[PDB]
């Protein structure tokens, strides 16, 4: 059935979107607002009053203090705008390289494993966003490995803190330990923790 | 006397082509030249393949000059904000061996 | 004086000035001669204007700007002071203004 | 407890959102070892050069910094329609 209207111009719209991406900062936020709204209309996740972080009655056990406080350092209160935003960011286009909100963990206590788990969950619930911030999380993971596995860390870093895939698809580790800026995300460089090379 | 003088008798004589004793401004007053890559001022080159004479090198006064300056985008001397993050335990800090 | 060209009523002055400007060795100019954009932000940062100003003041002003610019330190380097005045292994995040 | 709500509901929602008109880029391939974003500029002979993806650091939009801690409320402070009398359209 004919509709008396112009065809949707795929080519011209993709071009104008590229131009807007290059010129219009609000654009990223525009698009997120659609997705985010959709998530809200899917009625898929809501905050509750009741937290569930600790088994009873481990929160009451005296030995658990150094653990409990650690978890309480990480656990943000639920807020639907932020939760929906975390959901939407997975599928909205990124026009300004995202950065991890820096963690200051030094990894002395065993309880510090919490931060590592927080990354793992984040790698699972949101593989895309994780893939965007993964080098900056590698910088925390290195302070983790150097404290828990100093020998393996020595060997790993000695191979190289980062790599660059070439033609033929082979990896070439830098051989050089160095902190990874997000300035590298647009570069040929990759964090080396995620090479999955034995 | 009148070492400072740059111009004299800015009036036209109605008979002779220029007044006796009238003095034109030195050409150096008007050569904006360039700013050197170093940041020192230069006069214009007097011939191709020749660099210009630095302005401070000689005794003439030049009254048009390039000045580098900062646009609004720079700013300096502003207080800047940070996030301090104190160590989780005082006993976990290490001093030696650095 | 270079601006008097084709504006001063005086004839000999106008002829002498037009001569000094038409000479190869000199060239008056006013306004924005040069521009330096940021490497990352792309916005212009340090622009060289051709002012009407004595070359001594221009030379000094350019010395100030040159010292400020060629130092290559930002306000992020300030955290290195905060690190010296706060307990060992304290942390300082952001904002990377560059 | 929460896994059914993710994998058997929210999964579908990503799958549909992934087809929305403006979600126009390949954000990830599933391979951390290899994936890099495709990168583009509006460039001209006349000297312009405009990256589509720039790194600029935190913006006014509030979109750039990512707190990973968001993962905690999700695991341990959120109802889902699938998880929680337990019938819910």
């Amino acid at each position: 059935a004919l509709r008396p209207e112009l065809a949707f111009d795929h080519d011209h719209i993709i071009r104008c979107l590229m131009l807007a991406a290059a010129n219009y900062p609000r654009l990223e936020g525009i698009i997120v607002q659609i997705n985010t709204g959709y998530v809200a209309s899917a009625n898929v996740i809501r905050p509750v009053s009741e937290k569930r972080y600790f088994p009873e009655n481990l929160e009451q056990n005296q030995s658990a203090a150094r653990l409990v406080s650690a978890v309480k350092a990480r656990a943000s209160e639920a807020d639907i705008s932020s939760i929906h935003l975390a959901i939407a960011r997975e599928v909205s286009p990124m026009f300004n390289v995202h950065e991890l909100k820096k963690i200051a963990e030094s990894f002395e206590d065993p309880s510090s494993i919490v931060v590592v788990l927080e990354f793992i969950l984040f790698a699972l619930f949101f593989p895309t966003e994780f893939n965007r911030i993964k080098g900056d999380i590698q910088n925390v993971l290195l302070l983790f490995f150097s404290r828990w596995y100093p020998v393996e860390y020595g060997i790993f870093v000695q191979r190289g803190a980062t790599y660059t895939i070439n033609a033929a698809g082979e990896f070439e580790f830098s051989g050089r330990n160095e902190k990874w800026d997000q300035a590298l995300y647009l570069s040929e460089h990759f964090p080396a923790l995620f090479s999955d090379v034995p | 006397i009148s070492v400072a003088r740059s111009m004299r008798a800015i009036v036209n004589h109605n008979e002779v082509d220029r007044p006796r004793g009238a003095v034109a401004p030195s050409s150096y007053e008007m050569d904006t030249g360039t700013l050197s890559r170093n940041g020192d001022l230069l006069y214009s080159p007097v011939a191709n393949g020749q660099v210009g004479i630095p302005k401070l090198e000689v005794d003439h006064i030049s009254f048009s000059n390039v000045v580098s300056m900062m646009t609004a985008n720079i700013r300096t001397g502003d207080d800047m904000a940070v996030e301090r993050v104190n160590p989780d335990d005082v006993r976990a800090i290490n001093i030696r061996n650095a | 004086p270079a601006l008097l060209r084709d504006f001063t009523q005086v004839n000999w002055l106008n002829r002498d000035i037009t001569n000094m400007l038409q000479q190869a060795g000199t060239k008056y100019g006013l306004g924005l001669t040069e521009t330096r954009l940021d490497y990352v932000r792309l916005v212009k940062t340090i622009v060289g204007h051709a002012l009407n100003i004595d070359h001594f003041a221009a030379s000094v002003l350019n010395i100030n700007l040159r010292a400020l610019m060629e130092a290559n330190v930002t306000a992020d380097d300030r955290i290195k002071a905060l690190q010296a005045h706060s307990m060992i292994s304290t942390q300082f995040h952001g904002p990377n203004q560059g | 407890n929460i896994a059914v709500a993710h994998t058997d509901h929210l999964s579908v929602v990503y799958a549909t959102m992934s087809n929305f008109m403006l979600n126009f880029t390949n954000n990830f391939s599933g391979n951390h070892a290899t994936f890099k974003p495709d990168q583009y500029v509006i460039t001209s002979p006349e000297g312009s050069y405009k990256p589509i993806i720039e790194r600029q650091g935190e913006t006014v939009d509030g979109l750039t910094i990512i707190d990973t801690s968001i993962v905690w409320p999700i695991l341990c402070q959120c109802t889902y329609p699938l998880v929680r009398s337990i019938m819910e359209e």
Partner: peptide
């Protein structure tokens, strides 16, 4: 505590 996507600034250095 509460989620925050920005840098949670809490000091100001003087020049």
């Amino acid at each position: 505590k509460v989620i925050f996507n920005g840098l949670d600034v809490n000091t100001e250095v003087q020049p």
